[PDB]
Amino acid sequence: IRGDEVRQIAPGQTGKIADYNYKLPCDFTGCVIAWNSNNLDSKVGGNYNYLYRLFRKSNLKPFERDISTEIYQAGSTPCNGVEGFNCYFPLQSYGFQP
Amino acid sequence: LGKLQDVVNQNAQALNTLVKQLSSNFGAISSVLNDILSRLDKCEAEVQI
Amino acid sequence: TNGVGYQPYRVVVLSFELLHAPATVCGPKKSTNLVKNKCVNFNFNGLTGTGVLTESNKKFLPFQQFGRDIADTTDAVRDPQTLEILDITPCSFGGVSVITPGTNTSNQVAVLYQDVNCTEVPVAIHADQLTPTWRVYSTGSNVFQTRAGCLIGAEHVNNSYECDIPIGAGICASYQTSQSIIAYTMSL
Amino acid sequence: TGVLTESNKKFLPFQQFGRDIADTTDAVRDPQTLEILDITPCSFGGVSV
Amino acid sequence: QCVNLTTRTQLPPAYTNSFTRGVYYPDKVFRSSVLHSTQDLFLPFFSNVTWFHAIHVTKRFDNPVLPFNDGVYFASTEKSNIIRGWIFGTTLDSKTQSLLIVNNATNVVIKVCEFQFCNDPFLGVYYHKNNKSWMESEFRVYSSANNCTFEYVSQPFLMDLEGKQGNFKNLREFVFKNIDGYFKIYSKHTPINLVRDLPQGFSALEPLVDLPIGINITRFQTLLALHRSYLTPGDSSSGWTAGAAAYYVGYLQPRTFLLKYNENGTITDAVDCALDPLSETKCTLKSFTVEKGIYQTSNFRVQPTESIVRFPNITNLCPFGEVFNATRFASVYAWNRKRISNCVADYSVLYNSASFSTFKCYGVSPTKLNDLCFTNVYADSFV
Numbered sequence: 102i103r104g105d106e107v108r109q110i111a112p113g114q115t116g117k118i119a120d121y122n123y124k125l126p127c128d129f130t131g132c133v134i135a136w137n138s139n140n141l142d143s144k145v146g147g148n149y150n151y152l153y154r155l156f157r158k159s160n161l162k163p164f165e166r167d168i169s170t171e172i173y174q175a176g177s178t179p180c181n182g183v184e185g186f187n188c189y190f191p192l193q194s195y196g197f198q199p
Numbered sequence: 200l201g202k203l204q205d206v207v208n209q210n211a212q213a214l215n216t217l218v219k220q221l222s223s224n225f226g227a228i229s230s231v232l233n234d235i236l237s238r239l240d241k242c243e244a245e246v247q248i
Numbered sequence: 249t250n251g252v253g254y255q256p257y258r259v260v261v262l263s264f265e266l267l268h269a270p271a272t273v274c275g276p277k278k279s280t281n282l283v284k285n286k287c288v289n290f291n292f293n294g295l296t297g298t299g300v301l302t303e304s305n306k307k308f309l310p311f312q313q314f315g316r317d318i319a320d321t322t323d324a325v326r327d328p329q330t331l332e333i334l335d336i337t338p339c340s341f342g343g344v345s346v347i348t349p350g351t352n353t354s355n356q357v358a359v360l361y362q363d364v365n366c367t368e369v370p371v372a373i374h375a376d377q378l379t380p381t382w383r384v385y386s387t388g389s390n391v392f393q394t395r396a397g398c399l400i401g402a403e404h405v406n407n408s409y410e411c412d413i414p415i416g417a418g419i420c421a422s423y424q425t426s427q428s429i430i431a432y433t434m435s436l
Numbered sequence: 437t438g439v440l441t442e443s444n445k446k447f448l449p450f451q452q453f454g455r456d457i458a459d460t461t462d463a464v465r466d467p468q469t470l471e472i473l474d475i476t477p478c479s480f481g482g483v484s485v
Numbered sequence: 486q487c488v489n490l491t492t493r494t495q496l497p498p499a500y501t502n503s504f505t506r507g508v509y510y511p512d513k514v515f516r517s518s519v520l521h522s523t524q525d526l527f528l529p530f531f532s533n534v535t536w537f538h539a540i541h542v543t544k545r546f547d548n549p550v551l552p553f554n555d556g557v558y559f560a561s562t563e564k565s566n567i568i569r570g571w572i573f574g575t576t577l578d579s580k581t582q583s584l585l586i587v588n589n590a591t592n593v594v595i596k597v598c599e600f601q602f603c604n605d606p607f608l609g610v611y612y613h614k615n616n617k618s619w620m621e622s623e624f625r626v627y628s629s630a631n632n633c634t635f636e637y638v639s640q641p642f643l644m645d646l647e648g649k650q651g652n653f654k655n656l657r658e659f660v661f662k663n664i665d666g667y668f669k670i671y672s673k674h675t676p677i678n679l680v681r682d683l684p685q686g687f688s689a690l691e692p693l694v695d696l697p698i699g700i701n702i703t704r705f706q707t708l709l710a711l712h713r714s715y716l717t718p719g720d721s722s723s724g725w726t727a728g729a730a731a732y733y734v735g736y737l738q739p740r741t742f743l744l745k746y747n748e749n750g751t752i753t754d755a756v757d758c759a760l761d762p763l764s765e766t767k768c769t770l771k772s773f774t775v776e777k778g779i780y781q782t783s784n785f786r787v788q789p790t791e792s793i794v795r796f797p798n799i800t801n802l803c804p805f806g807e808v809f810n811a812t813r814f815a816s817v818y819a820w821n822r823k824r825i826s827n828c829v830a831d832y833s834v835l836y837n838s839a840s841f842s843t844f845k846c847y848g849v850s851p852t853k854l855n856d857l858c859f860t861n862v863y864a865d866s867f868v
């Protein structure tokens with residue numbers, strides 16, 4: 102993830118990561134380790150291999166995974182699985198410059 | 200008949216005091232289950248409850 | 249170009265209070281039509297809960313939304329959409345007593361619903377939401393009204409005997425010999 | 437802390453500990469030598485002076 | 486490639502009564518001679534469990550897409566091992582990950598995988614002509630498998646996949662549930678000699694697996710193994726005889742139970758609290774025997790079934806772009822303060838662009854900010 106979102110890896114948090122990508126329980130025995138990975142996952146011109154889900158219908162359950170790439174209908178009209186106005190691709194790319 | 204009336208009054212007063220005692224927080228953030236369960240998830244609400 | 253500790257940080261502090269006064273800043277939820285007189289989970293302006301909603305009369309000054317009783321539990325709430333006062337009651341009540349001959353004899357039982365008329369037992373007990381096995385003990389032919397309450401599952405007998413299982417208000421129940429539970433006024 | 441003794445208990449393969457009415461652990465499966473050991477307090481009440 | 490069955494004689498769904506079934510160990514702890522109380526997802530006693538069966542001569546082979554509701558009790562009576570797998574998922578369309586448990590007569594395989602499932606999948610069995618035995622040359626479950634994040638191909642084995650005629654000999658009971666991304670399966674196999682609906686007896690379903698699939702499950706279906714021999718006419722869509730097996734599906738609900746652990750550590754009896762007044766008294770008194778008398782009993786009988794939300798109808802999105810996307814902030818000594826009212830604090834708009842180094846909330850759990858209304862909102866802004 103990015104640094105600013107490391108705080109979201111904890112029980113009872115909210116945000117992109119703690120709602121749409123990775124959720125932790127509060128009956129959670131275990132522990133969390135995070136370390137800066139610059140000059141290992143960031144390259145010149147931007148590293149776009151790492152993605153994160155930006156739009157979802159509802160929040161995730163704890164330890165639930167969602168790899169679906171279906172188009173997110175933000176507005177009223179169904180856009181029928183093609184990108185367009187008021188429909189977005191739910192996965193966005195981190196831009197990790199060094 | 201002060202004795203019998205005293206008995207009845209004692210019982211009624213005890214029950215009313217028991218009802219009144221539900222307003223005490225006992226260290227929790229509130230004395231109402233609904234407020235605790237709405238402000239906090241079970242994560243933090245378990246200890247208060 | 250200075251260190252991260254010296255870099256500028258923009259800060260906003262959002263101060264508010266909850267569940268104590270009328271609210272205009274709401275979350276991104278969608279309301280639902282009102283279902284009254286049913287054990288239901290409700291959420292009024294973020295105050296969640298479960299119970300039975302009914303209509304009543306209360307004079308709420310414009311700066312008041314909730315009302316609290318002696319026990320401090322919220323009892324009256326102003327509905328934000330349709331401006332009216334609704335009273336919350338628990339969707340159950342104490343006063344259910346189970347009469348039985350002891351196991352190793354039979355599994356039949358009787359139920360005494362205390363201080364309820366036999367006409368209004370189902371609404372009081374919310375038998376619509378109860379299991380099928382609880383509904384047979386809610387209404388039938390063995391329904392008997394007493395000064396204590398309504399007794400179900402035992403046939404009323406005009407005869408009088410000694411007290412085997414005391415019930416109340418001069419009523420005692422026993423296990424006759426097909427085999428069934430009887431309820432009768434005691435013999436002094 | 438306590439006193440370990442040997443005993444007889446049928447532990448299914450997914451069970452390691454055993455708990456009594458008071459919820460304190462009373463039987464433990466020794467990981468190295470597969471056997472059940474009972475833990476008792478190393479003292480007892482009943483001493484009068 | 487996959488073939489859709491065309492010959493069907495369908496009846497309305499059948500029901501039966503599940504009595505004192507579906508009890509499982511709730512923990513991996515040994516307790517002996519103890520009356521232990523618990524609350525969890527359990528199958529209520531004396532429940533209307535749905536009945537399905539495959540028998541021939543009326544050419545039913547029923548296997549619909551049933552719904553999954555926070556836990557399921559499955560129980561199959563069989564002798565020839567017809568009922569031989571399950572498919573779980575949310576849409577079963579390859580747009581979402583789906584779970585597949587299949588015993589293909591040599592291995593039991595568990596896959597969490599984006600499957601383009603058939604419409605009426607069947608695992609197949611075939612009485613071979615080149616040799617007088619049973620073995621299957623058809624595996625008709627899915628058409629594609631991509632982005633495939635789990636695998637439990639087991640050790641090889643061999644099983645009596647033959648078609649036996651007579652009386653049932655195996656009752657296999659399973660409890661599935663999905664909690665915190667963990668698929669818990671409890672299992673029990675017992676020999677029974679009955680050709681009826683659910684037998685008389687108490688089971689003690691042991692924990693089988695706790696798989697980490699981490700998916701959303703709302704529907705399933707069963708994978709039945711087609712019989713096929715040289716005594717049936719027609720093509721694959723007609724030339725198949727049904728099996729001779731039956732299954733039953735329940736639906737777990739949150740219930741409080743009493744359980745009795747015997748001297749050897751096994752569950753032998755239980756009480757469904759909130760079933761009938763007598764069980765309610767056994768449950769309140771914490772015993773399996775009640776002597777003659779009258780007992781005051783607590784309130785477990787009624788449980789909630791629906792939820793209501795009643796919020797003000799306000800449509801004006803809240804000024805997030807004026808406090809966060811402000812051209813200029815205030816100096817900390819003259820810190821700005823802004824009243825906020827008549828809002829819908831969706832705050833998902835900030836996800837697109839704004840990233841916050843610190844976001845700490847006091848007096849409120851962050852998860853509950855979507856389920857609340859705030860009275861006197863002030864934004865104090867500075868640098």
Ligand SMILES: C=CC1=C(C)/C(=C/c2[nH]c(/C=C3N=C(/C=C4\NC(=O)C(C)=C4C=C)C(C)=C\3CCC(=O)O)c(CCC(=O)O)c2C)NC1=O
Binds near residue numbers: 568569586645
């Ligand atoms: C489908 C998933 C599947 C599961 C979960 C499974 C579990 C399972 N099956 C077993 C035996 C066995 N399992 C089967 C067959 C089955 N058992 C079933 O759950 C099903 C659906 C069938 C086929 C219809 C048989 C025939 C035995 C041996 C019975 C015996 O030898 O008496 C055992 C005990 C193994 C041992 O004691 O060494 C386990 C744990 N086997 C499977 O194939």
Ligand SMILES: *[C@@H]1O[C@H](CO)[C@@H](O[C@@H]2O[C@H](CO)[C@@H](O)[C@H](O)[C@H]2NC(C)=O)[C@H](O)[C@H]1NC(C)=O
Binds near residue numbers: 162702
């Ligand atoms: C798991 O899958 C189900 C089915 O897709 C989701 O429930 C549906 O969500 C949509 C909105 O996204 C609603 O229109 C449907 O009415 C819902 N159906 C039911 C029965 O609730 C569910 O949201 C998914 N669970 C999670 C955590 O994402």
Ligand SMILES: CCCCC/C=C\C/C=C/CCCCCCCC(=O)O
Binds near residue numbers: 803
């Ligand atoms: C215009 C301000 C409205 C104020 C509403 C007040 C309280 C309800 C919303 C609370 C959270 C504020 C947004 C913080 C988003 C953090 C998500 C993240 O990036 O991790």
Ligand SMILES: *[C@@H]1O[C@H](CO)[C@@H](O)[C@H](O)[C@H]1NC(C)=O
Binds near residue numbers: 330
């Ligand atoms: C919206 O709110 C108003 C008053 O606040 C109320 O009269 C009305 O019933 C609500 N619902 C709709 C659809 O307007």
Ligand SMILES: *[C@@H]1O[C@H](CO)[C@@H](O)[C@H](O)[C@H]1NC(C)=O
Binds near residue numbers: 365367
């Ligand atoms: C309910 O019972 C009370 C006293 O028994 C009686 O006054 C009242 O009329 C009854 N109401 C009905 C509808 O029967």
Ligand SMILES: *[C@@H]1O[C@H](CO)[C@@H](O)[C@H](O)[C@H]1NC(C)=O
Binds near residue numbers: 380381
């Ligand atoms: C459900 O079970 C009850 C008995 O507990 C029975 O009265 C009822 O008819 C059953 N309903 C269905 C649809 O099976």
Ligand SMILES: *[C@@H]1O[C@H](CO)[C@@H](O)[C@H](O)[C@H]1NC(C)=O
Binds near residue numbers: 405
């Ligand atoms: C008891 O007496 C009343 C009238 O005195 C009568 O109506 C009633 O039928 C009697 N009970 C039975 C079971 O017959």
Ligand SMILES: *[C@@H]1O[C@H](CO)[C@@H](O)[C@H](O)[C@H]1NC(C)=O
Binds near residue numbers: 467468469
């Ligand atoms: C090591 O473990 C095995 C079984 O786990 C046990 O039999 C053995 O006694 C232990 N000690 C040594 C030295 O191997």
Ligand SMILES: *[C@@H]1O[C@H](CO)[C@@H](O)[C@H](O)[C@H]1NC(C)=O
Binds near residue numbers: 488604
């Ligand atoms: C089965 O037949 C084809 C595939 O062979 C499929 O497109 C169709 O949807 C299926 N028929 C029905 C009634 O579902």
Ligand SMILES: *[C@@H]1O[C@H](CO)[C@@H](O)[C@H](O)[C@H]1NC(C)=O
Binds near residue numbers: 590592
């Ligand atoms: C099906 O059975 C065959 C037997 O050779 C085995 O190779 C295979 O692993 C089984 N299917 C899967 C998906 O493993």
Ligand SMILES: *[C@@H]1O[C@H](CO)[C@@H](O)[C@H](O)[C@H]1NC(C)=O
Binds near residue numbers: 168631632
């Ligand atoms: C999911 O499958 C599609 C099919 O091409 C592929 O493009 C995509 O990269 C896969 N995503 C993951 C996380 O495997």
Ligand SMILES: *[C@@H]1O[C@H](CO)[C@@H](O)[C@H](O)[C@H]1NC(C)=O
Binds near residue numbers: 747748749
């Ligand atoms: C407990 O296990 C032993 C040996 O397996 C057996 O003799 C005994 O019968 C079992 N206890 C009961 C009540 O059956």
Ligand SMILES: *[C@@H]1O[C@H](CO)[C@@H](O)[C@H](O)[C@H]1NC(C)=O
Binds near residue numbers: 810834835837
């Ligand atoms: C805030 O500013 C950024 C950059 O101009 C823009 O991408 C984003 O849409 C804005 N978000 C809001 C809520 O105004």
